[PDB]
Structures are given as structure tokens and as C-alpha cells.
RNA sequence: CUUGUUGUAUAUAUUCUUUUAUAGGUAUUAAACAACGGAGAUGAGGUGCGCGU
DNA sequence: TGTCTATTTAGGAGAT
DNA sequence: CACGCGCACCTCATCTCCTAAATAGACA
């Protein structure tokens, strides 16, 4: 495993934005040449031209004249079946002798080998590899249906070849024992694979021809790889350069050779590589060859690489804790009843209910659902409904929000004056996360409004919707992005999100070390993605309230009998400009409707703002150097399932086939689970059982493999959700919801 | 070189910002806890805005 | 006439 | 379900790459 360390240069360095810019321009010229000649030239022409121009017996010319590559397009040099260095050398020398990139030197007279050959050309080739190695016709990895449509069979044969990187029948023979010597082989699938082999034998040449045609037709007009105009980074791979420590200092020195002589760049020190540690030696002994020069905030940074010894522990399963992430009442609800035993732990829902100011404002049924959380180990009391009372002045939670904030900010000073640093940081970041999300909402809504205003004022007039050039030219020439107004908002938003990310990382570090210090050897999360987040419904927009919905200039007494629009007219969300006699003209958002839309956007924006899906990544990153490891479980299963009987609720479909139900149906009103427990406490106790029970563990997760970097100890299985269901019925852990 | 990046001060001043207002900008003051594999490219998705349907 | 720096070339992926 | 064409923003996924020896050229 290789890690990177970034240093900051001290003083003046010859590397500036001019050198980086010419590096980027060279990259773009070489990439343009490759893009133009990607499907036009043969490797044979290149190899022959170098053979007849220079004259040598090297291997990178022989490999281009070997009847395996002569009558092949240049894009085959970027595949994985071609030697990764012969292709580099052949392409480099064909480009160099013809001087196609337009190389005229570089500003600092950096060695051409370190700047052109293993500089921008190496990046060009590496980038074109990823494109062409990931260039394939996306076909479903499904069952071939045995003797299905001949078109289906032929596509199945060809796709599975590149799916498993096959070449010929020699690849099929290794596949035979692969499914014959496996537990529970799918005999029906094995017959399909037998048919796949049978049809492969007769029409193998047809497969090659179709594969060759499709790949070229997928690069008919690619446009090439382009280095963006904001990159501000150059990469040089130098074999012989020296990094030394500064004398009686914590800094370093980088003696790279500029213009046939060795320069000296002085670097600041890193606590990451602090003196006398076991990682400063790992750095100074095993550092790599690539040097990255990057400019961030008009300051130059140098990035190195070194070999690191991974030491991630193995799973233990002696102690386990679940953890559900749901952006409803508390962010992190875990699966341990709070009994005042976790050392260093602070419970904020127990703290808040001990003060009469907060409890008095709560109704009878709110105290009953706050006491539920005050007994469960929970983190980050992010109250979305209370938080929106900072943006909405005429709200009903405006008084609860102030008391909640006052108590939390008082705890923040109490913890600081008692010198409890970890808890103080946790609470301080909780407060700041709550404060920063409203700022992000404010700025994003202002960006939306200032885009609307700009586009209404400009009044871009374009023809019928057919194409890009067919549309107005002013759009590309004067886009909202390049307007100075929007350019500043996008920096304000970047800074706000930058604070949000750090506060979230601090909270997650608090949780991880809390569970590590006490003795827990696994933290179980679920593989959450953006689909789980239940978006609130935004009111239909005015521009499409009457145009799409066919309610444009329609009778006031009866516009239509659509029930949803009926509901929206029941309240005063919408205003309608009536005509002379019972029609519509225009609609304007009323105050209640506008604030309802804002409330719908405020809850929705936090799926992307607060990294709902990527919370698991922080725990996985912390697990690399920590004692406690992390297990991931399949999503869309734990929340609904009952943690008392350990079974899945389901509803009988019209056909009578059992259908797994949805979270909303298995949840009572008041957002409580029909089991009687909290909705998040229930899911946490489910995530735990899928890791505590050996029988369940093999169903949902994947087998323990050797430790890696940023890889969970237990990962979600690749088996399909339906396949999970059938195993979940083998163990009979299944129930019928209401029949 | 009591050293890099980010986070953590409801800290002191403000003729500042409603386009960060329990926060930030501009200058001072306090340290101590944490985490830290980077660069580039390609692709997918969501969201906003205009034009029309 | 050593001595440092820059250039050329590396062949033919397999087991999992 | 909004639909299509563009101007953008962000978040997320996946891939390449992080070498080493021999040799020629540039110096005093
Ligand atoms: Mg900040
Ligand atoms: Mg700092």
C-alpha cells in the first residue's frame, strides 16, 4: 500500500502557474492528436515508420509488426492485452520523431525525460487507458435464458467475454471447473453456460468481428481527454532525486535537477511525518519517483509517495454495536440502551430533558417520544423541524429552537470549563453543524433566485428545441456561472460546506473513539445510498401548474377532478388570476405556499449537504488504524424488519405472491414502529443482529477477507435482494403484516 | 520550523455582511485535541435556471 | 579523464 | 411521470500510477 504526503514549500520556488500552464497546454495538444488519430491509423504504420527512420532491433518496434497488432487501430495500444511499456515507448517515439505535440522545450529547462516523456505524455497515456479499458457496451449481467432469441444468445456470448476478460475456448475450460467445483452450483445456470460454450465454438470469429466494430463505434467522436483550465498541477517522474532533512529544523529539502544542475526547494515540516516517529523513516527510505507540483490558494505544494505497512486488525465478534443513520430526529441512533457506562460518553437527550424550560414547551406526545431517545445511546441531536424555525420567523417551533440552542450552547461552555476536551469538541461541532446548515440553505436559495432573476432579465430567445448551436448563442457567451454575482456565491457555498464536512468528521471521530475505548470490536452500519432518503414532496411549480397539468385557462368552478390538485386548492398554497368569466390567467405563490416549498427544500437539501450516503466512509477510514473495525449490511432491509421477532413484514399481492412491504406501511402514525419501539432504535437493533448471528452473517455480508485500505472488514453481499429474501424464508424469519 | 491541510472560540474590536446573522468578512488573542493517499481522467446520477411543449 | 545528468528500453499474465 | 435542448453546481464510482538498469551526453 502506498500513501501520499503533501508538503508546503517555504520561500520562492521557480515553479509557477506559467510552467504549469504550458505543461497543461502540451497535454492538451498531445491529447488532441491522439483523439484525432485514435481510429484512423494502424500500429503497423507507426512501427514501420520508426523502423525505416531510426533503425533498431528494440522490442517496442517488433511488437508493432507481429501480425497481432499490425492491422489494428491505435486505440488497441491502450487496452490491457498490450504490454504497458512497449505501447508507451512506441507511441512516444512516433509522436516525438514527427514532433506532433509541438514541443519547443519548457520554461525552466526541466529535463525532457522528466517533463515530456514521463511528464504530460505519461498522464495522457494513462488517462486514455482508463477510457478505453472502461469502453464497453453496457449489457445486463443476467441469465441468458438458455435457448433464447439468437440475438440475445450472441450478445450474451460476446458480453461475457469482456465481462470476464476472456480470449478463446481456453478461457471457457477454466470456467467449467469454476462452477463445477463450487458450493450449491446453479444447475440451471450451468446448462446456460454449457449452451454459451456450445454456441461460442461455431461463431467465435463473428464474436471478434462484432466486438471490433462496436468498440470503434463507441469512439466515433469522443473529443479526447482534456485537462481543465483550473487544474493548477503538473506531474514529473524523476528517477534520481534526493529528499533530505533540514539541519536543526523540522523541515525538509528537495534537490530536484533543473537545467543540468540540482536546485533546492525547502519544505515545511509535517506532524504527519514528525521527527523521531516510525513514519518519517518509512517516508525517507521508501519514497517514490512521481513529484506533483500543485497550486492551491496561490501557494505551491509538493506531493510525494511512499510505501506504508498496513496493520488493520481482524474482526472479533465478541462485542458488536449497530448504528442507524436517519436525518429525522437524531443523526446517529445506536443499538445500546444508555445505562451511564460508556466512559467519556455524553448523552444530550438525557441532558435536554433535565431542564424544565425545554420540557414545558413539549406536548404530551412529544415528551413521550423524547424520553424514548433519552434512554438509547445516541449522537448529534440534529432537530430538522426545530432548525427550520431559524429561517421561518412565523413558525410554531420558534420557541423550542431557542431553548434547545441555549441549553446546548450552555453545555458547550460547561464542558470547556470542566476540561473535558473530547466531549467539548463533540458538542461544539454539533452546535456549529446546526448553525452552518441554515447558512448553506440561505446561500443555495439565494443562488437559485439570482439565477432566476438573471435568466428572466436576459430573456434568452432561441428557436425550436432541436440542438445546441440551434439555440441562442448568448447562452454560452454569457452564462450565469461566469457572471460575477454567481461566482462569489459559489465560493461562499464552498467555505460553508468545508466547515460542514469538518464538523461531521469531528462528530464521527467522537463516536468511533467512544465505542473503541469501551471495548466494542465491530460497528455495524448499512450500505446507505441516496435512494433511502425519503424526499419531501415540493408543491407543483407555477410554470408547470397549469401548462403541463392542462389546467391552463380552465374554468374556476371545475378545473379538473384530480385529487392532488384538489388538495393543493383546499389550502391557500396557490393563488389564481381569474379571467372575465371563470377561467385562469396566471398563478402567484402565496405566503403559505412559498414557505411550504421552502420547508420542503430545507429537508431535501440535507441528503446532499450532509453526506448521508458517505457517513460509512468516515467509519471505514477510521477503522484502518483503529482497534474497532466496521461491518456493512445491505440497505432497505433493517429499518422495516421487526427487531423483537427478527422477521420481515410483507403484504399479499394481487397475484397472491408474497411481497416485502415498505417502511411507511410497517410504521404506525407518529413515526413509531408497530413493534412499539423507536423507528431508529429498531433499525439499530436489526443492524446488530445481522452481524451478531452467524446464520444471518453469511446471508447479508461477505466472508472475511484479508485487510485492505478503506475496505470494510465485512462488506455487503453482491447477491440480489430477491436472493436475500429466499434465504430469509429458509430460516423462516418472516411474518405477514396484516391479512 | 512550539512545523503542512481541515475542524473545533456562541473569545476581544467593528461605521462590516441578512449574498454564512446562534454565522461569517476584516484585524488581534488562546491553545489543545483529532483525522489526514494524492493527482489526473472518464462515466453515472441528482438538483437549479431559461426556452418551448 | 573522471563525474554528474539525461536518455533509452523494458516481449510474450497467471493464479485467484 | 412532467418531456426535450442547453448553461451550470455537487456527489459518487472506477481506473492508472506512484520502476529500475543500462547507456549516452555534457561538463570541467
Ligand atoms: Mg472554515
Ligand atoms: Mg490550524
XYZ file of N, CA, C and O (backbone and C1' of nucleotides) in Angstrom, chain A residues 2-4 8 10 127 227-228 231 249-251 266-267 269-271 274 390 409 412 416 424-425 428 432 436 439 448 451-452 455 462 475 488 492 498-499 506 509 513 543 608 709, chain B residues 1-11 17-25 30-53:
484
model
N 0.494 2.219 -0.829
C 1.236 3.459 -0.991
C 0.403 4.618 -0.473
O -0.800 4.685 -0.735
N 1.036 5.524 0.264
C 0.374 6.711 0.774
C 1.077 7.952 0.252
O 2.228 7.907 -0.181
N 0.361 9.068 0.306
C 0.853 10.350 -0.163
C 0.989 11.311 1.006
O 0.177 11.307 1.936
N 4.288 21.868 2.037
C 4.223 23.238 1.556
C 5.633 23.785 1.413
O 6.450 23.659 2.329
N 8.623 26.467 1.293
C 8.951 27.676 2.026
C 9.840 28.547 1.152
O 10.847 28.073 0.618
N -4.491 8.335 -18.884
C -5.885 8.746 -18.969
C -6.600 8.039 -20.107
O -7.739 7.591 -19.947
N -7.523 18.479 -20.148
C -7.154 18.951 -18.822
C -7.806 20.308 -18.594
O -7.603 21.241 -19.378
N -8.589 20.414 -17.524
C -9.422 21.586 -17.308
C -8.571 22.809 -16.985
O -7.431 22.707 -16.530
N -6.830 23.282 -13.257
C -6.167 22.134 -12.646
C -5.026 22.582 -11.740
O -4.938 22.164 -10.581
N 16.182 21.578 12.383
C 14.884 22.068 11.948
C 13.984 20.872 11.702
O 14.459 19.740 11.588
N 12.683 21.131 11.628
C 11.708 20.093 11.334
C 11.307 20.071 9.868
O 10.350 19.380 9.508
N 12.011 20.817 9.017
C 11.705 20.896 7.609
C 12.473 19.875 6.787
O 13.245 19.067 7.294
N 12.922 24.146 -0.344
C 12.775 23.922 1.085
C 11.304 23.752 1.432
O 10.463 24.543 1.001
N 10.994 22.724 2.216
C 9.621 22.373 2.550
C 9.383 22.565 4.040
O 10.297 22.385 4.848
N 7.690 21.364 7.623
C 7.535 20.064 8.236
C 6.076 19.671 8.365
O 5.184 20.506 8.284
N 5.841 18.376 8.558
C 4.510 17.837 8.794
C 4.487 17.089 10.113
O 5.392 16.303 10.397
N 3.450 17.329 10.915
C 3.193 16.452 12.048
C 2.820 15.050 11.587
O 2.917 14.100 12.371
N 6.302 13.575 11.595
C 7.031 14.220 12.678
C 8.324 13.481 13.009
O 8.446 12.267 12.833
N -35.298 28.798 12.554
C -34.368 29.903 12.380
C -34.558 30.619 11.055
O -34.274 31.816 10.969
N -25.637 25.424 23.901
C -24.505 26.338 23.967
C -24.053 26.595 25.397
O -22.897 26.971 25.606
N -21.903 23.686 26.120
C -20.623 23.890 25.448
C -19.623 24.639 26.315
O -18.435 24.309 26.286
N -16.247 23.044 28.421
C -14.971 23.722 28.250
C -14.340 24.091 29.585
O -13.131 23.920 29.766
N -16.279 18.321 24.750
C -16.383 19.720 24.361
C -16.332 19.876 22.850
O -17.137 20.611 22.275
N -15.399 19.184 22.191
C -15.312 19.250 20.736
C -16.564 18.674 20.100
O -17.083 19.226 19.123
N -19.375 21.225 20.564
C -19.044 22.414 19.797
C -19.257 22.220 18.306
O -19.677 23.160 17.627
N -22.170 23.875 15.752
C -21.722 24.508 14.519
C -22.342 23.861 13.291
O -22.623 24.551 12.314
N -24.445 25.888 10.618
C -23.931 26.001 9.258
C -24.913 25.491 8.218
O -24.876 25.945 7.066
N -27.024 28.292 7.002
C -26.268 29.170 6.116
C -26.178 28.585 4.715
O -26.323 29.304 3.719
N -30.278 30.158 -6.344
C -31.416 29.845 -7.207
C -32.151 31.110 -7.634
O -32.478 31.284 -8.816
N -30.136 33.138 -10.091
C -30.174 32.550 -11.424
C -31.486 32.854 -12.131
O -31.490 33.208 -13.319
N -32.602 32.736 -11.407
C -33.898 33.051 -11.994
C -33.956 34.502 -12.449
O -34.425 34.797 -13.552
N -31.826 35.059 -15.616
C -32.344 34.451 -16.834
C -33.644 35.109 -17.280
O -33.953 35.135 -18.476
N -34.427 31.670 -28.236
C -33.880 30.613 -29.069
C -34.992 30.004 -29.908
O -36.181 30.206 -29.646
N -26.195 32.246 -24.646
C -26.156 31.341 -23.502
C -24.724 30.952 -23.155
O -24.300 31.064 -22.000
N -19.210 34.528 -6.758
C -18.933 34.748 -5.341
C -19.775 33.831 -4.461
O -19.306 33.330 -3.427
N -18.695 31.235 -1.336
C -19.345 31.199 -0.029
C -19.863 29.798 0.282
O -19.660 29.276 1.387
N -17.241 23.258 3.420
C -15.967 22.881 4.005
C -16.017 22.833 5.519
O -15.419 21.934 6.116
N -16.689 23.790 6.150
C -16.896 23.708 7.593
C -17.809 22.546 7.974
O -17.567 21.868 8.983
N -15.499 15.458 12.863
C -15.267 15.508 14.304
C -16.304 14.701 15.074
O -15.956 13.982 16.020
N -15.542 10.978 14.514
C -14.394 10.581 15.321
C -14.763 10.416 16.783
O -14.304 9.466 17.429
N -14.216 6.708 18.544
C -13.358 6.514 19.705
C -14.154 6.186 20.956
O -13.639 5.489 21.835
N -44.919 27.519 -13.252
C -44.729 27.437 -14.698
C -45.327 26.158 -15.270
O -45.710 26.113 -16.444
N -27.788 15.765 0.338
C -26.539 16.009 -0.368
C -25.585 16.849 0.471
O -24.367 16.656 0.411
N -7.050 -1.238 2.478
C -7.165 0.169 2.826
C -8.531 0.678 2.393
O -8.922 0.501 1.236
P 11.697 30.189 11.680
O 10.761 28.998 12.172
C 11.285 27.969 13.002
C 10.322 26.818 13.159
C 10.914 25.576 13.818
O 9.910 24.918 14.587
C 10.165 25.033 11.648
P 9.946 25.008 16.188
O 8.417 25.135 16.605
C 7.573 23.995 16.635
C 6.451 24.167 17.628
C 5.547 25.370 17.407
O 4.534 25.123 16.448
C 6.201 25.282 19.676
P 4.466 25.987 15.096
O 5.527 25.283 14.145
C 5.942 25.895 12.936
C 5.919 24.906 11.806
C 4.548 24.342 11.474
O 3.824 25.183 10.597
C 6.122 22.579 11.660
P 2.283 24.885 10.282
O 2.333 23.939 9.006
C 2.719 24.430 7.733
C 2.165 23.557 6.642
C 0.650 23.497 6.573
O 0.116 24.561 5.811
C 1.550 21.305 6.486
P -1.278 25.232 6.220
O -2.354 24.155 5.779
C -2.550 23.831 4.415
C -3.686 22.856 4.259
C -4.918 23.161 5.089
O -5.756 24.128 4.487
C -4.348 20.888 5.343
P -6.611 25.122 5.404
O -7.735 24.183 6.023
C -8.659 23.516 5.179
C -9.459 22.475 5.922
C -10.136 22.922 7.204
O -11.325 23.664 6.995
C -9.072 20.852 7.562
P -11.742 24.810 8.039
O -12.297 24.004 9.292
C -13.419 23.143 9.165
C -13.661 22.351 10.424
C -13.699 23.139 11.715
O -14.934 23.795 11.918
C -12.414 21.175 12.013
P -14.978 25.255 12.574
O -14.942 24.978 14.140
C -15.879 24.110 14.758
C -15.361 23.588 16.073
C -14.877 24.628 17.067
O -15.932 25.232 17.795
C -13.292 22.886 16.919
P -16.208 26.810 17.691
O -15.035 27.473 18.532
C -14.654 26.946 19.797
C -14.376 28.032 20.806
C -15.494 29.050 21.003
O -15.514 29.452 22.369
C -13.529 30.162 20.316
P -16.775 29.091 23.288
O -17.826 30.223 22.925
C -19.171 29.891 22.636
C -19.687 30.640 21.436
C -19.894 32.135 21.632
O -18.716 32.880 21.371
C -21.860 31.169 20.730
P -18.626 34.434 21.761
O -17.112 34.635 22.205
C -16.692 34.320 23.524
C -15.308 34.848 23.805
C -15.054 36.293 23.413
O -15.527 37.208 24.383
C -13.258 34.937 22.681
P -23.129 46.637 6.170
O -23.046 45.113 5.721
C -22.475 44.754 4.473
C -22.452 43.260 4.289
C -23.792 42.557 4.409
O -24.531 42.612 3.202
C -22.147 41.381 5.651
P -26.014 43.227 3.167
O -26.956 41.953 3.274
C -27.169 41.327 4.532
C -27.766 39.952 4.393
C -29.150 39.912 3.768
O -29.339 38.654 3.118
C -29.282 39.238 6.039
P -29.594 38.588 1.532
O -28.347 37.782 0.957
C -28.025 36.478 1.431
C -26.580 36.123 1.168
C -25.548 37.061 1.794
O -24.384 36.318 2.151
C -25.278 37.047 -0.548
P -23.663 36.565 3.564
O -23.714 35.141 4.270
C -24.947 34.450 4.429
C -24.840 33.352 5.452
C -24.557 33.819 6.877
O -25.174 32.928 7.806
C -22.812 32.413 6.148
P -26.701 33.132 8.267
O -26.602 34.103 9.523
C -26.310 33.591 10.817
C -26.384 34.664 11.872
C -27.785 35.044 12.335
O -27.713 35.479 13.691
C -26.730 36.934 11.447
P -28.045 34.475 14.895
O -26.714 33.622 15.065
C -25.676 34.039 15.945
C -25.223 32.914 16.844
C -24.744 31.655 16.125
O -23.711 31.027 16.882
C -26.609 31.132 17.482
P -22.166 31.352 16.584
O -22.096 31.503 15.004
C -22.014 30.362 14.168
C -21.973 30.748 12.717
C -20.735 31.504 12.269
O -19.637 30.652 12.007
C -22.659 32.595 11.451
P -18.136 31.156 12.256
O -17.868 32.181 11.071
C -17.565 31.713 9.767
C -17.907 32.740 8.722
C -16.867 33.812 8.470
O -15.829 33.373 7.613
C -19.002 34.806 8.665
P -14.391 34.085 7.650
O -14.670 35.541 7.078
C -14.897 35.753 5.694
C -14.850 37.220 5.363
C -13.631 37.965 5.881
O -12.502 37.832 5.036
C -15.573 39.160 6.458
P -1.610 34.786 22.743
O -2.608 33.591 23.086
C -3.194 33.483 24.374
C -4.137 32.310 24.467
C -3.587 30.965 24.031
O -2.784 30.348 25.021
C -5.740 31.271 23.109
P -1.193 30.252 24.830
O -1.016 29.583 23.397
C -0.717 28.201 23.264
C -1.889 27.342 23.666
C -1.845 25.894 23.220
O -1.036 25.102 24.073
C -4.018 26.803 22.879
P -0.283 23.800 23.514
O -1.385 22.658 23.616
C -2.108 22.464 24.819
C -3.404 21.743 24.566
C -3.307 20.520 23.678
O -2.864 19.383 24.395
C -5.134 21.854 22.992
P -2.748 17.957 23.674
O -4.239 17.400 23.698
C -4.637 16.385 22.797
C -6.087 16.509 22.409
C -6.501 15.662 21.224
O -6.750 14.322 21.590
C -7.345 17.848 20.958
P -5.809 13.152 21.030
O -6.669 12.528 19.849
C -6.324 12.779 18.500
C -7.537 13.055 17.654
C -7.381 12.711 16.186
O -7.652 11.348 15.936
C -8.266 14.890 16.395
P -6.489 10.375 15.431
O -6.875 10.129 13.911
C -8.233 9.979 13.541
C -8.551 10.714 12.266
C -7.535 10.587 11.152
O -7.607 9.352 10.469
C -8.199 12.836 11.346
P -6.258 8.648 9.963
O -5.825 9.534 8.718
C -6.748 9.825 7.683
C -6.283 10.974 6.824
C -4.888 10.855 6.252
O -4.821 9.969 5.159
C -5.215 13.039 7.069
P -3.877 8.682 5.256
O -2.784 8.947 4.140
C -2.859 8.274 2.896
C -2.848 9.226 1.736
C -4.198 9.829 1.379
O -3.969 11.083 0.743
C -3.435 8.535 -0.416
P -4.715 12.417 1.230
O -4.131 13.531 0.262
C -4.692 13.725 -1.026
C -3.645 13.688 -2.112
C -4.151 14.007 -3.507
O -4.190 15.405 -3.729
C -2.752 12.083 -3.560
P -5.292 16.052 -4.693
O -4.706 15.796 -6.145
C -3.399 16.222 -6.492
C -3.011 15.679 -7.839
C -4.130 15.655 -8.859
O -4.313 16.900 -9.498
C -3.039 13.567 -8.842
P -5.768 17.318 -10.015
O -5.937 16.494 -11.366
C -4.992 16.630 -12.415
C -5.065 15.480 -13.387
C -6.433 15.194 -13.974
O -6.769 16.060 -15.039
C -5.447 13.174 -13.268
P -8.304 16.416 -15.325
O -8.854 15.148 -16.114
C -8.233 14.702 -17.311
C -8.560 13.258 -17.584
C -10.031 12.941 -17.772
O -10.473 13.194 -19.093
C -9.090 11.406 -16.250
P -11.963 13.716 -19.359
O -12.847 12.393 -19.339
C -12.624 11.356 -20.280
C -13.199 10.049 -19.800
C -14.695 10.039 -19.539
O -15.456 9.861 -20.717
C -13.575 9.049 -17.718
P -16.915 10.516 -20.840
O -17.810 9.672 -19.826
C -18.152 8.323 -20.107
C -18.751 7.633 -18.906
C -20.082 8.168 -18.408
O -21.181 7.678 -19.154
C -18.625 7.807 -16.576
P -22.592 8.442 -19.108
O -23.153 8.146 -17.648
C -23.611 6.852 -17.286
C -24.046 6.808 -15.842
C -25.096 7.827 -15.429
O -26.413 7.443 -15.780
C -23.356 7.808 -13.837
P -27.542 8.564 -16.000
O -27.828 9.114 -14.533
C -28.332 8.253 -13.523
C -28.288 8.901 -12.162
C -29.039 10.210 -12.024
O -30.432 10.017 -11.860
C -26.916 10.401 -11.001
P -31.469 11.146 -12.331
O -31.441 12.204 -11.143
C -31.718 11.806 -9.810
C -31.233 12.836 -8.824
C -31.770 14.242 -9.030
O -33.053 14.415 -8.458
C -29.427 14.324 -8.714
P -34.082 15.478 -9.078
O -33.422 16.890 -8.748
C -33.297 17.334 -7.406
C -32.454 18.581 -7.302
C -32.920 19.779 -8.110
O -33.987 20.482 -7.500
C -30.594 19.497 -8.393
P -35.061 21.257 -8.408
O -34.289 22.566 -8.879
C -33.860 23.527 -7.930
C -33.015 24.605 -8.560
C -33.602 25.302 -9.772
O -34.538 26.300 -9.411
C -31.316 24.789 -10.156
P -35.754 26.670 -10.388
O -35.055 27.445 -11.587
C -34.376 28.672 -11.361
C -33.667 29.139 -12.605
C -34.483 29.083 -13.884
O -35.381 30.167 -14.028
C -32.362 28.146 -14.279
P -36.796 29.938 -14.752
O -36.485 30.194 -16.292
C -35.914 31.419 -16.723
C -35.228 31.276 -18.058
C -36.093 30.813 -19.219
O -36.835 31.877 -19.791
C -34.061 29.599 -19.205
P -38.356 31.661 -20.249
O -38.235 30.915 -21.649
C -37.569 31.527 -22.743
C -37.196 30.516 -23.797
C -38.344 29.686 -24.353
O -39.047 30.359 -25.384
C -36.526 28.269 -23.802
P -40.498 30.992 -25.108
O -41.465 30.154 -26.056
C -42.192 29.044 -25.557
C -41.821 27.769 -26.271
C -42.785 26.609 -26.091
O -43.898 26.685 -26.963
C -40.579 25.856 -25.729
P -45.359 26.265 -26.447
O -45.378 24.678 -26.587
C -44.905 24.040 -27.769
C -44.570 22.589 -27.524
C -45.769 21.682 -27.253
O -45.506 20.379 -27.771
C -44.326 21.659 -25.380
